[PDB]
From a paper:
DNA polymerase β (pol β) fills single nucleotide gaps in DNA during base excision repair and non-homologous end-joining. For gap filling, pol β is tasked with choosing the correct deoxynucleoside triphosphate (dNTP) from the cellular pool to form a Watson–Crick pair with the templating base. The hydrophobic hinge of pol β is positioned between the palm and fingers subdomains and facilitates rotation of the fingers subdomain to close around a matched dNTP. Ile260 is located in the hinge region and alteration to Gln ([name]) results in a mutator pol β enzyme.
To further characterize the binary [name] complex, we solved the crystal structure of [name] in complex with DNA. The dataset collected from a binary complex containing 0.2 M iodide in the cryoprotection reagent (2.25 Å) is the most isomorphous with the ternary [name] model with dA in the templating position and dUMPNPP as the incoming nucleotide. Model building and refinement of this structure reveals that the [name] binary complex more closely resembles a typical ternary (RMSD 0.49 Å) rather than a binary complex (RMSD 1.22 Å). Many of the residues that typically undergo movements in the transition from binary to ternary in the WT polymerase were found to already be in their ternary positions in the [name] binary complex. In the [name] binary complex, all hinge residues are found to exist in their typical ternary positions, with the exception of F272, which shifted only to an intermediate position due to the closing of the fingers domain. In the binary complex, the amino group of the Q260 side chain forms hydrogen bonds with the backbone carbonyls of E295 (in the fingers domain) and hinge-adjacent residue Q264, bringing both into their ternary positions. In the [name] binary complex, the templating base has prematurely shifted into its ternary position, while the primer terminus undergoes a smaller shift but remains in a near-binary position. Finally, two additional hinge residues (L194 and Y265) also prematurely adopt their ternary conformations. We also demonstrate that the crystal structure of pol β [name] assumes a closed fingers conformation in the absence of incoming nucleotide. Therefore, distances calculated from the steady-state FRET and the crystal structure support the presence of a closed binary state, which suggests that the ground state for nucleotide binding for [name] is partially closed and that this conformation renders the enzyme defective in nucleotide discrimination.
Author numbering: 10 to 301, 304 to 335
The structure:
Amino acid sequence: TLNGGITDMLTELANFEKNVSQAIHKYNAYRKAASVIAKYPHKIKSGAEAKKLPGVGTKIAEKIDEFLATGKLRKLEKIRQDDTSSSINFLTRVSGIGPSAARKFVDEGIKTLEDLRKNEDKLNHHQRIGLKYFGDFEKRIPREEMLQMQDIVLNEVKKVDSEYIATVCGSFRRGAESSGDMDVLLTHPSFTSESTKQPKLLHQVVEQLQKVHFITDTLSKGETKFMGVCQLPSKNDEKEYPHRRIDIRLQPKDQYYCGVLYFTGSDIFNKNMRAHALEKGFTINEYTIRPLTGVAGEPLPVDSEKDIFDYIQWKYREPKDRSE
DNA sequence: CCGACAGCGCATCAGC
DNA sequence: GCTGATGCGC
DNA sequence: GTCGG
Ligand SMILES: [Cl-]
Ligand code: NA
Ligand code: NA
């Protein structure tokens, strides 16, 4: 990356404000600035140059000036030497443990990986599985593996019901060569926004993927959202694949486009698009787009992803151009 | 200067 | 058990 | 922390 040193600094600051300071808006602010800087096709020479970018203000510009001049940030150096901040930042790396639980664990003396591995009875089910695959969940997923995972999911899904349609979204759909997880969008004609003609639609698919030993664990599971763990099958005498995070989302068939837009991402892209929608007088979720007194109106007709872009007056962006 | 910052499903808890 | 507020991840 | 009213 051209400005990897700068974006890493802002990303580290973002993680600090979220996990330690618990300031979610500062967290989003740093990420937004890091994102727009990452896409900047020039090697930044000064904070003043960066300040021209939307999302970069005075304070970050000062930090950029310090980093370019010294190669480091004194603010981050002090944070790294803070034991409380270090313990919290580590504990939050476990899936299921947020800023509140992390700080609570530190008060109770639980602040290391070794402490967690002898205090599993103090964790909820989500946190326990997150600890179980602490290392694997921080591993990236090669696209080659994502293809194998996709092939398994789609085929096992077909065997349950041919009317099922499974679409792999996330960074994979954006054509990335590596993904953080697998986010599957599932639709079935019996499940629309109007009615649910068949129960256990999500359960059947999860069951099947568990039968073929693809899904190994379950973080959380409901009627429309599944969060769990999956693993590719390895060959004889071969080292096992790392366990992977997989999300399966049952979406209303008639609301596929709003759904596929959200689950495609990226996260920063979604936040920017939804924020821009509000300025245009619209509100967007993974189901519909509505005009917005502040009271949301009736859903607008959507026959493509592009229609959502057209409403908020944006030139259409292919999934590959939504990786911010 | 200063209000608003995207939006939601599942797990968990407390008040009744 | 129902309702609503929180934490959490995305 | 940054932006728009
Ligand atoms: Cl809606
Ligand atoms: Na700016
Ligand atoms: Na966490």
